[PDB]
């Protein structure tokens, strides 16, 4: 391999250098924005508790104030 050893080793070295270049070149940057995760709850109406107000008396009418 007197006339084969040189070009093969040259190609091997060039491939190694290209691989190193490709790997490290992309590491820079790659983190421009930060996006926080979202964890919401299911907004549904199943078995809602029911509150009832009742006003009654011997009078005809009344004035009523209440808290919703």
């Amino acid at each position: 391999l007197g006339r084969i050893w040189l070009p093969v080793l040259i190609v091997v070295a060039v491939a190694a250098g290209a691989l190193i270049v490709m790997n490290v070149r992309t590491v820079f940057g790659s983190n421009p924005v930060v996006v926080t995760e979202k964890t919401s709850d299911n907004a549904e109406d199943f078995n809602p508790k029911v509150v009832t107000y009742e006003i009654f008396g011997s009078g005809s009418s009344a004035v009523i104030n209440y808290m919703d």
Partner: protein, 48 residues
């Protein structure tokens, strides 16, 4: 003789220090465009 000296050419062909991939430059430009105020990434301070 054809072109100016190297000093003038270097003065008129200067390159930005930070690449556009830089997250900080992108952040400043994003602030500028969102707030609709500017579109650069460099600022100076005037002291009185």
């Amino acid at each position: 003789t054809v072109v100016p000296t190297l000093d003038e050419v270097g003065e008129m062909r200067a390159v930005s220090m930070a690449p556009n991939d830089a997250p900080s430059t992108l952040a400043i430009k994003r602030v500028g465009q969102v707030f609709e105020e500017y579109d650069t990434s460099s600022s100076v301070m005037i002291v009185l």
